[PDB]
Automatic annotation (TrEMBL), chain E:
<feature type="DNA-binding region" description="H-T-H motif">
    <location>
        <begin position="306"/>
        <end position="324"/>
    </location>
</feature>
<feature type="binding site">
    <location>
        <position position="226"/>
    </location>
    <ligand>
        <name>Mg(2+) 4</name>
    </ligand>
</feature>
<keyword id="KW-0731">Sigma factor</keyword>
<feature type="binding site">
    <location>
        <position position="223"/>
    </location>
    <ligand>
        <name>Mg(2+) 6</name>
    </ligand>
</feature>
<keyword id="KW-0479">Metal-binding</keyword>
<feature type="binding site">
    <location>
        <position position="219"/>
    </location>
    <ligand>
        <name>Mg(2+) 5</name>
    </ligand>
</feature>
<comment type="function">
    <text>Sigma factors are initiation factors that promote the attachment of RNA polymerase to specific initiation sites and are then released. This sigma factor is the primary sigma factor during exponential growth.</text>
</comment>
<feature type="binding site">
    <location>
        <position position="223"/>
    </location>
    <ligand>
        <name>Mg(2+) 3</name>
    </ligand>
</feature>
<feature type="binding site">
    <location>
        <position position="219"/>
    </location>
    <ligand>
        <name>Mg(2+) 4</name>
    </ligand>
</feature>
<feature type="binding site">
    <location>
        <position position="219"/>
    </location>
    <ligand>
        <name>Mg(2+) 3</name>
    </ligand>
</feature>
<feature type="binding site">
    <location>
        <position position="342"/>
    </location>
    <ligand>
        <name>Mg(2+) 11</name>
    </ligand>
</feature>
<keyword id="KW-0963">Cytoplasm</keyword>
<feature type="short sequence motif" description="Interaction with polymerase core subunit RpoC">
    <location>
        <begin position="138"/>
        <end position="141"/>
    </location>
</feature>
<feature type="binding site">
    <location>
        <position position="92"/>
    </location>
    <ligand>
        <name>Mg(2+) 2</name>
    </ligand>
</feature>
<feature type="binding site">
    <location>
        <position position="253"/>
    </location>
    <ligand>
        <name>Mg(2+) 10</name>
    </ligand>
</feature>
<feature type="binding site">
    <location>
        <position position="339"/>
    </location>
    <ligand>
        <name>Mg(2+) 11</name>
    </ligand>
</feature>
<protein>
    <recommendedName>
        <fullName>RNA polymerase sigma factor SigA</fullName>
    </recommendedName>
</protein>
């Protein structure tokens, strides 16, 4: 409102430059209401599409990444780029600026292989597996023996 | 540490089974894996344009036309950034300026119709998503759902 | 056109809603009163309807007044809302088939089959001899012969009778590997279209480019068959390329078009060059047509929702309210007299 | 009052622009003789 | 590329790799979630630390490093040192309480695991509350928030499984969301069902009349206190706003906003008004005795609109005295030199 406040503690021009004690309103007309700006505080950042999708990706250019595809890849979806260091291998050393998939990335953080094969009946595979499962290191391709052939084809323990 | 995240030697995760004294130790190490503006914000701050300036200088005049040509286009952006004006960490958004209010009116039309600058439906988009994000972080956080949101959020910021 | 609503199976069906007679007669208010008061002078219309059942019983709920349709003043103008309004006539490409010179390559011209309503294919025949022929419905091309084969035209009988005088026949008998299997050509073309559809669908899509919808219900006799016998090809059995009696389709239109293409490209059967702007190519839409169209668009909208209620109504008493809702036809027709450009 | 019309203040077209422009990351700041600020939005942009 | 498909694939792929078995896996995780609580509490008990703090430190060690604590929640828990201190005391807990620590983490873990596995459940549910005015992704996400809510209250002691339980806690979350965010102008849940009922009623009323009900039927059919004024009001709020920016006139290039006029702003005419008005009012205000003129000038023109409370020490008799005698001498000389007569309003 014109020179008035919201509640009205002060209502004319004499004190034009001050704000209200219990509530905040410094006044000149509602033009201050049309020129002022507020901001939203984003949780986890996002990027300006004005810079990401212009033909020469100004961030793709500057950051040597796939100028047009590496961006889109990690930006909008989950394709991770190893930022500083990552000792463990894929087969080769840590990829300083290279990007990887959920799948392989998964294989990384928890352990090489996830195999949950749970037996059909109560006595056939429950026994083959048990006997060799608790303290016995099971080598790749451990041929459990009963329903069909419970195949454990990967690493260390069980 | 208990049975989620613990880095001992090159192997980096540690589960615990108090049954028999068994310290399950999975093997992949501290792999900085990031996706979204989060990852690019990092990469963007780490770069000393001066270095890439000089590096491209050499890349520009010395190798054959294929990689030197790409380097000349890539030196353009890096130069201005440094030349005069402002530095490159800003292309990343984490504080969204909001357009004034009277510029995105809410008005009484006829009978009771109301007209509002379309910008306000987008703003609500962002804010809701941003908030739902914060609440999803705090509530507890299942990965798929956090990113899923962060994706929406991103789009919204566009 | 849209009354015999056949809805058969997905759960329980066998629905048959049938049209008897259309009657509209007592105007709500009169002309002057419609101008003094803000009124739309429209005549009331409710036709007779009777829905059948697969179980013993056919309930006939006589009238349902849906759609108040404006009438014409004896002078020719209307009275939609307060002000007298007029429906201006229009102009376009009359639904037929013509042959126009090719775009950029000075070489040879290509054929075009024009079927209006919008929903309904738009074909074109173009030959690029290093190894391909192009016939396009929605977009992507396929052989001109794979189709003739489907219908029943075999390499020998086709090539010899249609193009003996037309050496272009050789591009037709070219991919013999596929031309040696009849009905399998039907499935194979189905394959060519692209969604990742069930190979088996006896005679379903062939129907669509066959008898009912896409081709047209414009009067059987002079609507399209005029553009035919004189311009190209002699006969039409069923309005447009149509039949569903034995599963084996008949196409007295698909071969003549190519026939005229091989003819037009080889000499003077006549001089086959169509000046589009010739008025026997450009038709004038009189008021009636303009209203009948919005009238049927509405009928479709009506028939759309009625289908949903053939499943919603519990048992057999579903004739009146269960099948008809006047909201579509009203908005539809009303939109045309007040908002049409 | 029969006074010669005043010398134009900044047009709203301008102001609407700058802010529209501010609505997007970009920062549009006018400058002085020596590259220093100057103020279009008379006194409504400084904070509080 | 296009967002829906990616998330669908995203969680559908993980459920595809890890659906929870009907009894076992849900039971397992559940059991672990609860023991986590029982643990965190007993942890608070022997540490004197707030269950809220014990819950955030175990979260940090299982869900994320300093990174996740620093950005989401600004900065009160020192990124490194703080949380670690807490972890140390947890270690000091001998064999007996250490157990609870190890349990809390694993439980926290299961929570997350149980939450992952039941994401298809959300999507399947959320799938049906689609055309309400919310984005499918938004809907699934709110619903997702609903499932997390269910996880906090499920009691595995009471044999029923998480399926039926999540359904409710999710359906609640979604419907709320639909009612809270769908519109530009917020409308409480009661108004919402109100509007649904209004709508549903108008539907049953459309059934036979052939006449889109006057707001009479709606009042009747609705119930107890429904009247015309109420229904016309409700459907007036039911209409969503219009796009101040919509294609207008012939759809060429017409944006709905150059045509609305502006009211606060003094069209030139008014700026001229206030000039003479204030210059002339200011001239009068000066040629008068301050005592009761300023009183009524300031009481009426400076703050708010009290004869007695208007004058300082001098009571009412001198107020009315000078008010009515100065106001009339002021109006009658102003009658002489007519300046004010031409009503400035
Ligand atoms: Zn105040």
């Amino acid at each position: 409102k014109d020179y008035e406040c919201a509640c009205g503690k002060y209502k004319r021009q004499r004190f034009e430059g001050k704000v209200c004690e219990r509530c905040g309103v410094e006044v000149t007309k509602s033009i201050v209401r049309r020129y002022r700006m507020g901001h939203i505080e984003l949780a986890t950042p996002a990027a300006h599409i004005w810079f990401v999708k212009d033909v020469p990706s100004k961030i793709g250019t500057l950051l040597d990444l796939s100028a047009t595809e590496l961006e889109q890849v990690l930006y909008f979806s989950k394709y991770i780029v190893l930022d500083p260091k990552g000792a463990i291998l894929n087969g080769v050393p840590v990829e300083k600026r290279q990007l990887l998939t959920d799948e392989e990335y998964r294989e990384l953080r928890y352990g090489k292989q996830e195999t949950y094969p749970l037996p059909p009946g109560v006595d056939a595979l429950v026994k083959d597996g048990e006997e060799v499962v608790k303290g016995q290191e099971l080598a790749p391709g451990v041929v459990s023996r009963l329903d069909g052939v419970a195949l454990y084809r990967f690493p260390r323990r069980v | 540490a208990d049975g989620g995240k613990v880095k001992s030697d090159v192997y980096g995760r540690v589960e615990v089974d108090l049954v028999r004294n068994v310290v399950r130790v999975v093997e992949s190490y501290d792999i900085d894996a990031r996706m979204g503006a989060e990852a690019i914000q990092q990469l963007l701050k780490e770069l000393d344009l001066e270095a890439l300036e000089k590096e491209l200088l050499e890349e520009m005049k010395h190798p054959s036309r294929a990689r030197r040509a790409k380097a000349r286009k890539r030196l353009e952006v890096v130069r201005a950034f440094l030349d005069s004006g402002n530095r490159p960490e800003w292309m990343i958004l984490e504080a969204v300026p909001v357009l004034p209010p009277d510029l995105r009116p809410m008005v009484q039309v006829d009978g009771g119709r109301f007209a509002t600058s379309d910008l306000n439906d987008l703003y609500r988009r962002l804010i809701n998503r941003n908030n739902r994000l914060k609440k999803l972080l705090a509530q507890g956080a299942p990965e798929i759902i956090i990113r899923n949101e962060k994706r929406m959020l991103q789009e919204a910021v566009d | 056109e849209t009354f015999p609503i056949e809805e058969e199976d997905k759960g329980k069906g066998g629905l048959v809603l049938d049209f008897l007679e259309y009657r509209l007669g007592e105007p709500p208010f009169p002309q002057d009163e419609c101008r003094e008061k803000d009124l739309t002078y429209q005549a009331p219309l409710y036709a007779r309807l009777q829905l059948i059942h697969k179980d013993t019983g056919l309930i006939k709920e006589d009238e349902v007044f849906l759609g108040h349709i404006p009438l014409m003043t004896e002078d020719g103008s209307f009275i939609i809302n307060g002000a007298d309004r007029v429906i201006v006539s229009q102009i376009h490409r009359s639904p037929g088939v013509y042959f126009t010179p090719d775009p950029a390559r000075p070489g040879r011209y290509i054929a075009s089959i024009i079927p209006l309503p919008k929903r309904g294919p738009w074909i074109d025949l173009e030959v690029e001899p290093n190894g391909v022929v192009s016939m396009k419905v929605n977009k992507r091309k396929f052989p001109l012969v794979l189709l003739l084969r489907v219908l029943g035209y075999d390499q020998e009988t086709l090539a010899r009778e249609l193009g003996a005088y037309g050496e272009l026949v050789q591009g037709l008998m070219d991919e013999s590997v596929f031309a040696m299997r009849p009905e399998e050509a039907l499935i194979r073309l189905f394959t060519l279209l692209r969604p990742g559809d069930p190979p088996k669908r006896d005679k379903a899509v062939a129907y669509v480019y066959g008898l009912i919808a896409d081709p047209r219900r414009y009067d059987l006799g002079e609507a399209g068959r005029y553009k035919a016998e004189e311009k190209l090809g002699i006969r039409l059995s069923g309005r447009t390329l149509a039949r569903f009696e034995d599963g084996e389709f008949k196409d007295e239109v698909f071969l003549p078009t190519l026939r005229y293409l091989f003819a037009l490209t080889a000499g003077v059967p006549g001089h086959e060059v169509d000046d589009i702007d010739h008025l026997g190519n450009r038709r004038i839409r009189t008021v009636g047509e303009l209203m009948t169209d919005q009238f049927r668009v509405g009928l479709a909208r009506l028939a759309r929702g009625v289908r949903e209620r053939m499943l919603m109504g519990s048992e057999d008493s579903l004739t009146p309210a269960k099948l008809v809702n006047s909201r579509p036809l009203e908005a539809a027709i009303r939109e045309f007299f007040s908002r049409s450009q | 009052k029969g006074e010669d019309v005043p010398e134009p203040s900044v047009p709203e077209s301008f102001r609407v622009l700058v802010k529209e422009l501010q609505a997007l990351a970009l920062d549009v700041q006018t400058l002085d003789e020596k590259d220093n600020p100057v103020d279009i939005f008379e006194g409504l942009a400084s904070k509080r | 590329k296009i967002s829906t498909s990616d998330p669908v694939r995203q969680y559908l792929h993980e459920i595809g790799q890890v659906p929870l078995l009907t009894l076992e896996e849900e039971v397992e995780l559940a059991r672990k979630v609860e023991e986590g609580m029982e643990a965190i509490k007993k942890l608070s008990e022997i540490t004197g630390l707030d269950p809220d703090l014990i819950r955030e430190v175990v979260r940090a060690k299982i869900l994320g490093s300093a990174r996740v604590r620093h950005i989401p929640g600004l900065k009160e828990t020192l990124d490194p040192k703080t949380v670690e201190e807490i972890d140390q005391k947890l270690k000091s807990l001998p064999k007996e309480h250490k157990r609870y620590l190890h349990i809390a983490r694993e439980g926290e873990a299961a929570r997350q695991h149980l939450i992952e596995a039941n994401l298809r459940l959300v999507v399947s549910i959320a799938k049906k509350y689609t055309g309400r005015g919310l984005s499918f992704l938004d809907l699934i996400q709110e619903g997702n928030q609903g499932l997390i809510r269910a996880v906090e209250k499920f009691e595995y002691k009471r044999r029923f499984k998480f399926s039926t339980y999540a359904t409710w806690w999710i359906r609640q979350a979604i419907n709320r969301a639909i009612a809270d965010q769908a519109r530009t102008i917020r409308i409480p849940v009661h108004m919402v069902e109100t509007i649904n009922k209004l709508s549903r009623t108008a539907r049953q009323l459309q059934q036979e009349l052939g006449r889109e009900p006057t707001y009479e039927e709606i009042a009747e059919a609705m119930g107890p206190g429904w009247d015309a004024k109420r229904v016309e009001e409700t459907l007036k709020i039911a209409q969503e706003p219009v796009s101040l920016e919509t294609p207008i006139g012939d759809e060429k290039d017409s944006f709905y906003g150059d045509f609305i006029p502006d009211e606060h702003l003094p069209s030139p005419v008014d700026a001229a008004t206030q000039s003479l008005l204030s210059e002339e009012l200011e001239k009068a205000l000066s040629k008068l005795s301050e005592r009761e003129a300023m009183v009524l000038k300031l009481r009426k023109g400076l703050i708010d609109g009290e004869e007695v409370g208007a004058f300082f020490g001098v009571t009412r008799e001198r107020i009315r005295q000078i008010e009515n005698k100065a106001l009339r001498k002021l109006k009658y000389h102003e009658s002489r030199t007519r300046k004010l007569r031409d009503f400035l309003d």
